[PDB]
Design a binder for this molecule. Structure first.
Ligand code: FYA
Ligand code: FYA
Ligand code: MG
Ligand code: MG
Lengths: 346, 265, 214, 265
């Protein structure tokens, strides 16, 4: 009826289409035909069942990984945000960062002519416009997106601003950098990843308040306060950031039986120069504590009148335990020295 | 400023390993089109034993050491929100839910049922009195055993494998003929693991279902349909998976243990 | 071969089992047989495909609801805990609360002879034993379980204790009641539910610091 | 003490509606055994157009207003971690992933692919330049259209219904013959919603796949297998679902808007 010539006896036929039909070349083009003429609605409903080929087995892992993460954040208290993947070449300046490696040949606007190399510039920029529309006292949020450098990368950045948390009516607040860190530490605590920060110089980050991030054993992203110069180049007050690269590495849990024998408790302080980073401090004490150090925490410190003008004090609570048996004091005040020795012996 | 310093002590939450394992098992079956539903921990002798082809005075009633209850004014709800009667007890396995569901619904369907069950045995490191199981039921016309076999196989693959495989040995259960106990191939540790039991739903169970349905005014729905069900020990599996040694560890509210699974996902 | 007598021409046969076989009554009992003799391993692998009957449509909702919740908590900062469903009738006293409506006829121990009517007694009790084993400075946790009153009910309780949050080294802490409330408010904020508290007298709760939840 | 007082201002997080809708769409297909995988936003003209039966100088290349890129030292990775060549651009739809996946894997399989795509049109309230789509592909021997129809139907039921139904109209796409556009029955609002496109994978696409596979040394895997794919607008759907009016609202980082979906789940 469609003007095709059908020769042959079957089961496979010779069908020559009319010339006005340029869309008809393959056998499938021919099938689409019987379909539409008979009517797509006349095709029944069904569901397939089969064992997927093996190499398809783990596939979902990465995607899922990202989502559990995305989810954990919103649960920790971060409002999610979606930012355009574009970038204003100009901000490469406004925000002290290298230039975008990819540019558009047909930009939508000269302000969206490059491809974001970083995620935070956009967050910060969102911060501003929110302030101008509604005046939020504080704000904590994150975003996950694809940035473009040499290769396409999945990044994660978060921004904090405001008075902070505490009693609304009651005066005090507790906020700032150490608040953003607080959350971060908790997040990894929840992810089962050992994280720490070390001071690092960042062009876009106010120094002193600048720091590189070390997910479990590794360097990825940074964290710190937004460099004031930029803070002000924009009608904006102080902001706190961090931007990492995903996927985060993972430490497969090795379960471990905790022992019932009570731990060995200790009171200890360390006096070291005002410049020394908490880091190396904890590090040393820790690396010399010995193999039975169950806990290591810092309950206090202050510069201190009663000591060297250029040194500080450190409240360190200590705990020890031995799985099979209880720790004999012989080993405790002994190992303790093992530390104090190489402690400032260094 | 000293950035290497600790931040504001903020609470980092975690999830119980059983919840974790539950969730994983569920996500798995969800992918085969199974739906997760729950039942009550306090059941009627009717749903726990009678409904399933389990006799009063015969050797069957004697495989499960039950916890009987007493007390008045306690209202037990039936599949349809009706009050039911029977000596009260603590569900001995999750199977009862097979019945509450079938009474309240129409085939074909696929369900999986996680649940805390109770048994009177002495608590050792591989056995407890309070543990969880996961029940599975698929009813529909045409259902065959090969489907139950496929189902289980997809589970092994999903847990270990594809270098892993499934073991089905005949065993006896009052509510399924053919009955079977099944083991999974753990390529890693290199041993066979006896996971649970399963079989083709017993005719007498379908019978019971319709009979109770008509008693409630509903039309019979399980005449001429087939089905398989299975049920497995969750702790037995969580232990093997998350590498735990003492089953008693689960109900021992020790934080040092609990926190060990903080980042399981 | 199993000692059955098979009469009839087909397709449905008359099979009379030997008398020593008491387990053989239905046609299915007969099938389990061909199976095991042929070998369970000889049954192929397959997967079913069908459109589920309509009334099965929403089924998962409740279960899922609970889980998103369970999940949100762990993310807000609560350590999950699993407590036995049992109860020591004696604590009905120790903790000012009515008695358990359900008791065991075969208790595992006179201290697990009733069925928990509340969840918190158990949490608190867990608190203690933890302190005695390891000495945690602070603790924030929750548990979801089935309590038994007139009817079986799904409850959710959370317990906070310790110095609270703030700077470790730095002196101040911020904790106590208003901290637990802080989290609570946040949780609903996250659930999209409007919550508030109003002072209410609770036998097990220090008054003044007591309140009902809305 | 005054207990009615406000507690410690603690931050309550939320999730973006697109993420929410994404998640829902995914959970849905996950239940039919589909697996979620992602592709790159910056693609090669080869995977975006060439691989799929899309011509250079013909009317087809002219249905998608593309964003071309420039810049050096940018490394684009192929399905196997190899460097590929072609004029760089921003993926115009998610379809390219159909190819990267098929090149890297073996049938049978079911995948679904969420992804931010880019198009050069003018932004109104129902159209944008930066939006997301969700692609679906099922390849295997025996696959037929009725399966694609079933698939879509299960999606409608899952979203609205069971008093909801599906509409399939023939339409043209270079990569699928038979092609089709599909609408869903929204019993509530009482109107038909044009959701996306789908069809039976085009022979030329399977051809392209194997051809590139052998180029990479892999054996042909798609000879003699069949398949269907589809793709839908996520914002178009999130809007209808979560009751949003302006599509432009999504990329407008306004909190007052964002927070409105805090408790969506
Ligand atoms: N005391 C105990 N502690 C911990 N796990 C136990 C246990 N007793 C049994 N289990 C675990 O829980 C699983 C179920 O218990 P069991 O009594 O073997 O089966 C009982 C049925 N609910 C399983 C089934 C369902 C449907 C069709 C056929 C069989 C066992 O496979 C075992 O791994
Ligand atoms: N400018 C725009 N803004 C927002 N949504 C848009 C849009 N342009 C299209 N969409 C949505 O995104 C969906 C996909 O775009 P469209 O160009 O129509 O299809 C493109 C193919 N990726 C779909 C397909 C896959 C496999 C087999 C056949 C067809 C549309 O159904 C529409 O709902
Ligand atoms: Mg045609
Ligand atoms: Mg038999």
């Amino acid at each position: 009826r469609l003007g095709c010539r059908v020769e042959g006896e079957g089961p496979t036929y010779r069908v020559t289409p009319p010339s006005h039909r340029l869309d008809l070349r393959l056998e499938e083009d021919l099938v689409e035909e019987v379909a539409r003429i008979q009517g797509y609605e006349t095709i029944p409903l069904a569901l397939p069942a089969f064992f997927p080929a093996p190499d398809n087995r783990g596939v979902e892992a990465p995607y899922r990984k990202e989502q559990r993460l995305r989810e954990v954040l919103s649960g920790l208290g971060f409002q999610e945000v979606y930012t355009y993947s574009f970038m204003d070449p100009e901000d490469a300046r406004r925000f002290r960062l290298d230039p975008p490696r990819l540019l558009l040949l047909n930009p939508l606007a000269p302000e969206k002519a490059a491809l974001r190399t970083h995620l935070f510039p956009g967050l910060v920029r969102v911060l501003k416009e929110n302030l101008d529309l509604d005046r939020p006292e504080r704000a904590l949020l994150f975003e996950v997106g694809r940035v473009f450098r040499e290769r396409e990368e999945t990044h994660l950045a978060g921004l904090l601003f405001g008075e902070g948390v505490g009693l609304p009516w009651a005066k005090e607040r507790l906020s700032g950098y150490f608040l953003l860190k607080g959350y971060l530490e908790a997040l990894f605590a929840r992810l089962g990843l050992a994280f720490r920060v070390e001071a690092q110089a960042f062009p876009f980050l106010h120094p002193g308040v600048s720091g590189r991030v070390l997910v479990e054993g590794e360097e990825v992203g940074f964290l710190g306060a937004l460099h004031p110069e930029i803070a002000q180049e924009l009608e904006l007050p102080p902001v706190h950031l961090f931007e990492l690269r995903l996927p985060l590495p993972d430490k497969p849990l090795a379960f471990q039986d905790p022992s019932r024998h009570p731990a060995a408790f200790r009171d200890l302080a360390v006096v070291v120069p005002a410049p020394t980073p908490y880091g190396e401090v904890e590090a040393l004490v820790r690396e010399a504590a010995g193999p039975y150090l169950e806990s290591l925490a810092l309950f206090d410190l202050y510069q201190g009148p009663p000591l060297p003008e250029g040194h500080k004090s450190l409240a360190f609570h200590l705990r020890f335990r031995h799985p099979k048996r209880t720790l004999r004091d012989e080993e405790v005040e002994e190992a303790v020295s093992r530390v104090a020795e190489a402690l400032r012996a260094r | 400023v000293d950035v290497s310093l600790p931040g504001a002590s903020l609470f980092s939450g975690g999830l119980h390993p059983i919840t974790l394992m539950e969730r994983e098992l569920v996500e798995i079956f969800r992918a085969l089109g199974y739906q997760a539903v729950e039942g009550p921990e306090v059941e009627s002798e009717f749903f726990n034993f009678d409904a399933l082809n389990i006799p009063e005075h015969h050797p069957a009633r004697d495989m499960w050491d039950t916890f009987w209850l007493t007390g008045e004014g306690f209202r037990l709800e039936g599949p349809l929100g009706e009050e039911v009667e029977g000596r009260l007890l603590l569900r001995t396995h999750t199977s009862p839910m097979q019945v509450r569901y079938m009474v309240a619904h129409t085939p074909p369907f696929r369900i999986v049922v996680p649940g805390r069950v109770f048994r009177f045995e002495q608590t050792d490191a591989t056995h407890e009195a309070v543990f969880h199981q996961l029940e599975g039921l698929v009813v529909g016309e045409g259902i065959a055993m090969a489907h139950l076999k496929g189902a289980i196989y997809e589970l092994a693959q999903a847990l270990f494998g594809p270098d892993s495989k499934v073991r089905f040995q005949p065993v006896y259960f009052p509510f399924v003929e053919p009955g079977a106990q099944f083991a999974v191939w753990w390529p890693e540790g290199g041993k066979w693991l006896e996971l649970g039991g399963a079989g083709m739903v017993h005719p007498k169970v379908f019978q019971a279902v319709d009979a109770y349905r008509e008693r409630l005014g509903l039309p019979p729905a399980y005449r001429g349909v087939t089905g398989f069900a299975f049920g497995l020990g969750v702790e037995r599996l969580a232990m093997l998976r998350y590498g735990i040694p003492d089953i008693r560890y689960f109900f021992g509210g020790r934080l040092k243990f609990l926190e060990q699974f903080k980042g399981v996902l």
